Each structure stands twice: as C-alpha cells, then as structure tokens.
Design an enzyme around this catalytic site. Structure first.
Site, short mmCIF file in Angstrom:
data_model
loop_
_atom_site.label_atom_id
_atom_site.label_comp_id
_atom_site.label_asym_id
_atom_site.label_seq_id
_atom_site.Cartn_x
_atom_site.Cartn_y
_atom_site.Cartn_z
N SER A 1 0.97 -1.16 -0.06
CA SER A 1 -0.06 0.11 -0.12
C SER A 1 1.00 1.24 -0.12
O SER A 1 0.31 2.25 -0.42
CB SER A 1 -0.92 0.07 1.12
OG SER A 1 -0.39 -0.12 2.48
N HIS B 1 -6.43 -4.44 -0.32
CA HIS B 1 -6.50 -3.20 -1.38
C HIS B 1 -6.75 -3.70 -2.89
O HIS B 1 -6.42 -3.06 -3.84
CB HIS B 1 -5.01 -2.48 -1.06
CG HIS B 1 -4.99 -1.76 -0.15
ND1 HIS B 1 -5.29 -0.78 0.01
CD2 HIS B 1 -4.30 -2.09 1.11
CE1 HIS B 1 -5.08 0.01 1.34
NE2 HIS B 1 -4.19 -0.92 1.94
N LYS C 1 -12.41 -0.60 2.94
CA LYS C 1 -11.99 -0.05 1.84
C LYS C 1 -12.95 -0.35 0.95
O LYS C 1 -13.93 0.31 1.03
CB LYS C 1 -10.70 -0.90 1.56
CG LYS C 1 -9.59 -0.40 2.72
CD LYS C 1 -8.26 -1.05 2.80
CE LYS C 1 -7.53 -0.54 3.95
NZ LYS C 1 -6.63 -1.60 4.65
C1 LIG Z 1 -6.85 -2.02 5.61
C2 LIG Z 1 -5.98 -2.93 6.36
C3 LIG Z 1 -6.08 -3.36 7.67
C4 LIG Z 1 -7.06 -2.87 8.35
O1 LIG Z 1 -8.52 -3.16 8.39
P1 LIG Z 1 -9.50 -2.22 9.24
O2 LIG Z 1 -10.68 -3.11 8.79
O3 LIG Z 1 -9.32 -1.00 8.83
O4 LIG Z 1 -9.12 -2.48 10.71
C5 LIG Z 1 -5.21 -4.51 8.18
N1 LIG Z 1 -4.34 -5.13 7.36
C6 LIG Z 1 -4.16 -4.65 6.08
C7 LIG Z 1 -3.02 -5.28 5.15
C8 LIG Z 1 -4.85 -3.59 5.54
O5 LIG Z 1 -4.68 -3.29 4.53
#
Ligand SMILES: *Cc1c(COP(=O)(O)O)cnc(C)c1O
Ligand SMILES: *Cc1c(COP(=O)(O)O)cnc(C)c1O
Lengths: 397, 397
Positions: free
Chosen positions: B184, B212, B243
């Site tokens: 990311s 992502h 997301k």
């Molecule tokens: C976005 C993300 C998280 C966190 O997810 P939330 O639902 O915001 O707690 C954890 N690990 C990875 C790799 C992420 O991309």
C-alpha cells in the site's frame, strides 16, 4: 498442518453438541419485537441473555440519528482517522464521553476489546508492570500479551493479595493496576474503594473497566468507581458501546494531561478504520440520553432486584447474596442439569446465557440473566414462573 | 509515570505541527456531497486520500439496506455471537463472503485489524513459524506479537529471500507464510505467483491479505491472488470491509475443512460484540453488488491509469513505473517539499494522503492518491491540473 492443533477442540465441541439439543453457541434471533423479545426457533422468546442494559437499541432518537447519519454521511469512513481523515462525528462522540465521565480526555476505539488491548499494551512498556485480577476479562489478558510489560496476577477479589503482590514489586518502575467494576460471571462487584487505596499506596496508576455499569452505577451513571466515591482518583476508565450504549465501539477516558499522546503510540487506534457514521451517531445520541436516563435506570434496578429476590425465594442458588448488578447468576449442580434447565427455559420461551467449563471454573455451571431497563414487571414475573416450572421439572428446586 | 514514555513522541509531534500549517493527522470532512467530494476547512474538496475504492458508501441499495436494518433490528447487538446469540445477518454476510470468494469457509470479525490479529495469533502456535515480508502491515506484525509462534521476516519483495529463509527453518513444524497482494505504501503488487510456489515447495500454508484489491483484481474481483492464477492454492484470504465494501469489519475465508474450529479458539472473535445490524446489512448488500460491479471496476481502473499516466507525463516521480493498483504514490525530495505540496493541493481543493518518516522509510516522502470508481474523468483532469499547478509553485516539477 496449522489446524491440527484444534483437533481436540473439535472433538470436545462435538461431544458437547451430542449431549445437548440446542447448540448454545449458535443461537439466532430470527425476528425482533423489542430489546426484550425475539423469535428464536420459531417461538416468541423473552430475551434475558443479552447485554442491552438500558434498552437503547430501539430508542427512537438513537434509531433516527443512525438513519440520518447513513443518509448524510454514507455507510462507511475514509480509513484511519489519523491518516485518511474523519467526519466530525468522532470528535463529537469523544466530547460526549468527556461530558458523560466529566473528563478532559476521551479516545474512541473500534471495539471495547481493542480499547483494552490497545490501552494496556501501550501504557505499560518493557520493565513496567501490569497488575490484574486472576479472573480478568480476556481482553485485559490479551492487552498484557500484546504488550512487553511484566504481568502480575493477584488472587481473585483479594484486596490483601493485591496489596501484598504490589508491595513486593520493584519500587521505581511505573505500574498499571487494571480492575473491573463488575465481575461479570456471577454479577458481583469489586471492592474498588479498598483496591484503589492499595494501588495508590504503592504509587500505581489505576485503570478500571466499567463495561457492565454504564448509565446505572454512581450519581452520573459513570460506574462502580463513581458509586464507591472514587471520582478523581481513577487514572483511566475503559468501556464499550456494546452493552449499555447500544452499538459497537470502545473507549478510554482520563484526566491525564498527556492522554492525547496515546493516539500517537497506540497501534490498535492508528491501524484501523474509523467507526461508520451510523454507529457514531447512535453512540453519541445514546450516550447523551444516558446522562439523564433516570427512568430507565430505575426500571433496570427494579427488574434486577425483583428477579434476584424472586429466584432466591424459590430456592435457586445465586452467585450473589444481594442484588449487586444487572447480572443475576443461577448456579446449577452439574453440566447436564445446567443444559436441561437452559433447554427447558428456551423451549418455554425464555433465553438466558449458559456458562459452563471451560468458560467458567471447573465445577461451576451457570445460567446468567442480564436484565434490561425495558423489561416490564409482568415480564419479570413471567420469567420467575418459567424458572419455577423448569427448575421443578428438571429437579433444581 | 506511565505516560512519561511518550514525552519524545509529544515533542516530535509538536515540532512537526510547528513546521507546517494544516495538521495532516487531524483532517475533518465537515459536510459530504459524494464519495469524491467534501468540505474541508470550508472549501469544496476533491477526495483522493480515502480508501473508498468502489464508491459503495453512497450506493442507494447499500444505504437503503442499512436504514432498513436499523428500523427492523435496532442499533446494536446482543453481545458475543457465540455467547449471547446473533441476528441471522451474520450468517448471511458470511454466506456472501463464501459466494464472493467461492470458498466453503468464511469468518467475520469486528475489524480487518482484528481479523489479522486473530487469525495469525490463533493459527500459528508455540514452535511454529510465521513468515512475513519485512514491510508487512502493522496488523500482521501485531498478530505475530499476540501469538506465541516464531517470527521470520524476509527482505521486502524478495522471492529469493523468502525461499532462502523458508528453506532454512526446521522441516517438521507447521508454517504460515503471510503475504499482502498490494503493497500500500507505493501501490506496487506482490509477486504472489512466485512466492506462493516457494511457500508450497517448503510445505507452508499461505495467508494473503487482499484488503487493497477487493472487487477490482481477478476475474471475480477476489484479489491479486486471483489475478495471478492462484485460485485454489491460497489457504486463507484475509480482508476488510473498510476499503471497497464501505463499512467496518474484517474477515477470513478458506476452503480448509477444519476452518470452523477457528471460531472455537480465536479470542478476538469470541470476546467482542457482533457487528451492528446496519453495518452487516450494508456489508452484505455491498459485497453482493461487488460481485458484478463491472462498470465501477472499469471506471476505477480508467481513473487510476489516467492519473498515473498523467502525473508521470508531467515529470512527477511515482512509486511505480506502471499503474498496478488504485494507489498512485508521488515521491517528493524532502519533508518540507512534501508538506508544501500537500498544503498547496489542500488549499487548492484537493485532499491526498501524505506519508512521511517514520510512517515511511527515512528518505521517502509521499503523496498517496487512492482512486475511487466514482471519480469522473473531468475530476481526474482537474486533479492533474491541481498537481501541475502545485508542483510548479513549490518547485517539484
Ligand atoms: C486496511 C488493512 C487493515 C485494517 O483493516 P481495518 O478494517 O481498517 O481494521 C489491516 N491489514 C491490512 C493489510 C490492511 O490493508
Ligand atoms: C464487554 C467487555 C469487553 C468487550 O467489549 P466489546 O466492545 O464487545 O469488544 C472487553 N472487556 C470487558 C471487561 C468487557 O466487559
């Protein structure tokens, strides 16, 4: 492979399923009438096994605020508050918590579990000490595990052992004593006044979890600590939105002048998305109403005392001599009697929590009733009659 | 006391605030028009720093489902699914995930962070190994810390080092390789095909985080692993609702026949309240729409390629040579240039993410743009013009 380690848990679970009828770990409420009634296995059922203490989940202002937030702000958030920005609702719910608790600091988390995990693991570092009751909530133990501090268990509910264990630690390192106001298994209360005096004698900071007291202990509903005259002596108070407030979320409040620094260091705060608009709106509206929900508080306690006193009078063995919280625990003789009682109650139209080993200590088998402000006196009478009938039929009384 | 350990963080933060204008850690969106526009500091602002990849947060079906769930089921839940029961919505969102990923197993968690924390700490025990990229997400590291397994970092994005590190571990103990599909920070992609081949050569199980990529990589939108032809070779896929889906929550899916046993052992699953009705309803509706959201996916990728190609052509240094994800990272020369650029963009009506040390490696200063399916071509052109203007004014191009 990595799941072979669960073969024992899988076999144990199946044996337990085979010995009962309804799986207590897969209860589903198919339709809902209110905080106190739903359809379970096709039957209209009084709910007495859920944590909706103040019956806020169907409050018309709470619901309206949630709906409006969905309309105006959508279903979700931008990401992490710190990294991706937030709606103003997050500052607003933190303000509501400051107002509710009368504190200068409030930090909201995505869950109560994460609030405990995060605050404990962030506050106490290498060489420091977390001191906790042996029978502390899993989230508190998990915060200890996530951190790098030393862990110091003291004998359950023992002011004397807290004192002895604290006194034997090295003097210089900083120390966090973590207490729960209400012991949720039996619904008894911690001697916080005495324990906080001990903590302060040894120079420790104190964190109190008030998850099972919000809105109904203390003059302002702040918790057992408030009820016991400890206003201004508790360094941190941790709670949840999922019991009294009526949604998901956790928080920590404090008057510590450096409390904001916790946001900079607390990984479970930083590395998760902020709570959705509807959730924050329902929380804020609920918290504000809880500040003055005197009628709900009254009914909750009246209902609790009626159930506790009524069951005691019938000859049930309860977890507490007096009605000290909104949890009323009925103690049964063995695994089978507990399951038969629980099943009889369910079949007759009452859902309560069943707690058995290893969730409880070996030899302890409980039916746990969690009272709601929206239970009516008639419902509590119905519940008592249902307990009497099931207890006689099964042989408990 | 326990907060003295933050004195350094407090001083660092204040120095950083003093050197800039707007605090990037306290961005608030005061009013909202859409997934792509809000008012920030009183100015209509294009949102390009948020993770709303598929623009689901204002989808009219998603919003309607959330509102209906509030009306019919209330603001909250009964407690833990396992202990206090649940609405049928939880089984329904897990079914939606099974359908989305084509798996036999799905477990939903209260957050993506907790899904990673829980699954990693539960799957790998004492004497076992978790093998992960050196630059893994914090939640993955936090899962390692919560567990009692051995941790094995490999050099960032190195198939060769993964292979070498794995091969040198003891053969008998079970092993979990944890990978992310999209890196990311810069928006580049993991060589999952090659890395999964390596993991399988050494008999390791594989967990891939597809946070992502959901809805826009692979024929079914399942993620980078799907795009790279790895269907049926990935033991566990972890993701988030925050997301692409448009609400809070996490999940893990799997075809492992013992996957349900994870519920029995996973403390972050057991010891937290279930997600609210509105949240589960918005998630379920969104996930089902994402299965066939071809138009959104098209626009997302078109917008991403337009922004990436456009910025490259202007002479900006990007994190990637080709447009490989919905994150476009602009690399700046120093802390001050990044802040001045970010501020110029904000002042001109564009919000992007700024990432600087220690959130990024020392020497790396980024503006990160996260594209939305609901950005219009005109908005992307406006964004390009805003970057050109700010970049010239500040001296970046
Ligand atoms: C976005 C993300 C998280 C966190 O997810 P939330 O639902 O915001 O707690 C954890 N690990 C990875 C790799 C992420 O991309
Ligand atoms: C209820 C409770 C939690 C969990 O809160 P959630 O918001 O359900 O995650 C954690 N610790 C204690 C002491 C609790 O009572």
């Amino acid at each position: 492979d990595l799941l072979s380690k669960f073969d024992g848990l899988i076999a144990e679970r199946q044996k337990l399923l085979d010995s009962g009828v309804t799986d207590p770990f897969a209860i589903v409420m198919e339709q809902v009438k209110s905080p106190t009634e739903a359809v379970i296995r096709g039957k209209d059922t009084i709910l007495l096994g859920t944590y909706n203490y103040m019956g806020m989940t169907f409050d018309p202002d709470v619901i309206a605020a949630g709906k409006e937030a969905l309309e105006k702000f959508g279903s979700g958030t931008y990401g992490s508050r710190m990294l991706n920005g937030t709606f103003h609702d997050h500052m607003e719910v933190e303000q509501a918590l400051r107002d509710f608790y009368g504190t200068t600091g409030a930090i909201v988390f995505s869950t109560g579990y994460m609030a405990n995990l995060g605050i404990i693991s962030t506050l106490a570092g290498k060489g420091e000490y977390v001191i906790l009751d042996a029978d502390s909530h899993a989230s508190i133990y998990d915060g200890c595990q996530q951190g790098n501090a030393e862990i110091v268990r003291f004998r359950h509910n023992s002011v004397e052992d807290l004192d002895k264990r604290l006194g034997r630690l090295p003097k210089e390192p900083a120390k966090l004593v973590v207490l729960e106001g209400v012991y949720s298994m039996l619904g008894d209360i911690a001697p916080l006044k005495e324990m906080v005096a001990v903590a302060k004698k040894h120079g420790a900071m104190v964190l109190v979890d008030e998850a099972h007291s919000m809105g109904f202990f203390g003059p302002n509903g702040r918790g057992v600590y408030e009820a016991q005259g400890l206003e201004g002596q508790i360094d941190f108070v941790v709670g949840t939105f999922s019991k009294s407030v009526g949604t998901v979320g956790g928080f920590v409040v404090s008057n510590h002048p450096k409390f904001e620094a916790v946001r900079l260091a607390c990984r479970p705060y930083i590395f998760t998305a902020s709570l959705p608009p509807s959730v924050v709106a329902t929380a804020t509206t609920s918290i504000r109403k809880l500040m003055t929900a005197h009628e709900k508080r009254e009914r909750l306690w009246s209902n609790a005392r009626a159930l506790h006193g009524g069951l005691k009078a019938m000859g049930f063995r309860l977890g507490t001599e007096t009605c000290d919280s909104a949890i009323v625990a009925v103690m049964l003789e063995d695994q089978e009697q507990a399951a038969m009682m629980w099943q009889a109650l369910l079949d007759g139209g009452l859902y309560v929590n069943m707690a058995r080993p290893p969730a409880t200590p070996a030899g302890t088998f409980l039916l746990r009733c969690s009272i709601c402000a929206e239970h009516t006196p008639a419902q509590i009478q119905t519940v008592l009659g249902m307990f009497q009938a099931a207890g006689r039929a099964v042989g408990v009384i």
